[PDB]
Amino acid sequence: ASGLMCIGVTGHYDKTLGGIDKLAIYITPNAGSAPIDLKNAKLFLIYDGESHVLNYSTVTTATLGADDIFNSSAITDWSLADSSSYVVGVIQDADGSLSNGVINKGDIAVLLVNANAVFNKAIPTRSEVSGQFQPEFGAPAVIQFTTPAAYTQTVIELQHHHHHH
Amino acid sequence: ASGLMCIGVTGHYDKTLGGIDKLAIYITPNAGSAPIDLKNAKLFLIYDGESHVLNYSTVTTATLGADDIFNSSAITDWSLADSSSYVVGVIQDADGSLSNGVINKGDIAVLLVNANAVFNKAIPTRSEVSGQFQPEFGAPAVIQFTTPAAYTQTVIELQHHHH
Ligand SMILES: [Ca+2]
Ligand SMILES: [Ca+2]
């Protein structure tokens, strides 16, 4: 029984857009999982009366060891997070497997999503977001959060889990 | 300034089909909400790599006072819960509003969903189901449950009331 767990979601608040414009969904394998290929994995997100399906665009190691994973100067592959695609950032990967789109024991990946582009607007306060990240094989990671009623800083913890990023 | 809350989800376990074949999703308005029209409301469900949308069909009062919410002999409008439609049952109402698809203060409605029809199989053990019930106006009710590791009884409480 292999599968993926969501270990957190953070959002970027852009005050000029009035909301959360970008999401970072942190993923790790279930304890004891076999390796899982991410390359055909689909991200399903429901928001505001629409369901969206996003596909794998590419992977980048530019996120590795970085405090700011929302910055498109430092992580230029944000340019590929569009209305129908996510980018995978490497967070932790001892053996390098994520650079071939394979997540294995101990790995942490982040799914970079341009919510402004997917939803055609930034996500306002008190908004419900629901979703699953489903690779071809194994069980899915689950996304559920309600954005807070006030956005007070640029990086917002949306879904809290324990596992380190 | 209005919305719906999911106050729970139960499911029916069918041994012949090998899992949960029906869901009952219980809804009530958020405190302070204005009346909400359900007639154009959509139910979005994600399970096993597919996203499904279900539309409003009809509303039944046959669910009022029914101790078995899954009995399609008693609640004949279960026949209209198919791969693309849910049915609304009235559970609590004091002004008849739900009889014409409007939910208002103090009301509880149930959404009857034929999971077997929607997903083309019964929901097996250890499954993740995520969803939202979104009327045209107001904030949505949220569905999120993990089916248990074994099905030990006919009716399973899948999701509970949270604050
Ligand atoms: Ca690895
Ligand atoms: Ca009423």
Strands A85-92 and A50-60: parallel
Going B142 to B143 to B146 to B152, the CA torsion angle's sign is positive
Question: How far apart, in whole angstroms, are the C-alpha atoms of residue B10 and residue B23?
Answer: 6
Which residues 6+ apart lie within 8 Å of B87 measured at CB? B57, B58, B59, B60, B77, B78, B80, B81, B111, B112
- Which residues of chain B lie closer than 8 angstroms to A144, CB-CB? 130, 142, 144
CB count within 10 Å of CB A37 equals: 16
Question: How far apart, in whole angstroms, are the C-alpha atoms of residue B114 and residue B69?
Answer: 12
- CA angle, corner B120, sides to B115 and B121, nearest 5? 70
For residue B7, give the amino acid letter: I
Using only the alpha carbons of chain A, give its radius of gyration.
Answer: 15
Domain that holds residue B28: 1-163
For residue A68, give the amino acid letter: D
Instruction: Return the closest-CA partner of residue B123 out of B14, B39, B9.
Output: B14
CB count within 10 Å of CB A102 equals: 17
Strands A128-134 and A108-114: unpaired
Q: Is A46 in contact with B42 (Cβ distance < 8 A)?
A: no
Which residues 6+ apart lie within 8 Å of B135 measured at CB? B4, B36, B37, B38, B40, B41
Strands B108-113 and B4-14: unpaired
What residues of chain B have any CB closer than 8 angstroms to a CB in chain A? Answer: 42, 44, 46, 48-49, 51, 53, 126, 128, 130-132, 134, 136, 139-140, 142-144
Q: Is B132 in contact with A134 (Cβ distance < 8 A)?
A: no
Instruction: Tally the residues of chain B.
Output: 163
Q: DSSP per residue over A54-94, as a string?
A: EEEEEEESTTTT-S-TT-TTT-GGGGG--TTEEEEEEEE-T
Residue A4 near residue A27 (C-beta atoms within 8 A): yes
Question: How far apart, in whole angstroms, are the C-alpha atoms of residue A11 and residue A9?
Answer: 7
Question: How far apart, in whole angstroms, are the C-alpha atoms of residue B6 and residue B144?
Answer: 10
Centre of ligand 2 to C-alpha B101, Å, is 9
Structure token pair of residue B144: 């999120």
Place of tokens 């203060």: B105
Specify the DSSP class assigned to residue B34. Answer: P
* Residue of A1, A44, A49 lying closest to B46 (CB–CB): A44
Specify the DSSP class assigned to residue B139. Answer: B
Domain count, chain A: 1
- Which residues of chain A lie closer than 8 angstroms to B131, CB-CB? 46, 130
Structure token pair of residue A99: 């650079």
**Resolution expressed in Å:** 1.5
CB count within 10 Å of CB A134 equals: 25
Place of tokens 């790599």: B49
Q: Strand, helix or coil at B141?
A: strand
- CA angle, corner B23, sides to B18 and B29, nearest 5? 165
Specify the DSSP class assigned to residue B1. Answer: -
Instruction: Return the closest-CA partner of residue A115 out of A144, A85, A157.
Output: A85
* Residue of B44, B128, B134 lying closest to A139 (CB–CB): B128
Question: How far apart, in whole angstroms, are the C-alpha atoms of residue A53 and residue A45?
Answer: 7
Centre of ligand 2 to C-alpha A130, Å, is 28
Centre of ligand 2 to C-alpha B33, Å, is 12
Question: How far apart, in whole angstroms, are the C-alpha atoms of residue A143 and residue A31?
Answer: 18
Question: How far apart, in whole angstroms, are the C-alpha atoms of residue B121 and residue B113?
Answer: 13
Question: How far apart, in whole angstroms, are the C-alpha atoms of residue A48 and residue A27?
Answer: 24
Place of tokens 């340019």: A79
Place of tokens 């077997």: B116
Structure token pair of residue A5: 């767990």
Alpha carbon of B131: minimum distance to chain A alpha carbons (Å): 6
Structure token pair of residue B5: 């809350």
- Which residues of chain B lie closer than 8 angstroms to A132, CB-CB? 46, 128, 130
For residue B155, give the amino acid letter: V
Q: Is A128 in contact with B139 (Cβ distance < 8 A)?
A: yes
Comparing alpha-carbon positions, the chain A residue that sits nearest to B1 is A126
Centre of ligand 2 to C-alpha B35, Å, is 8
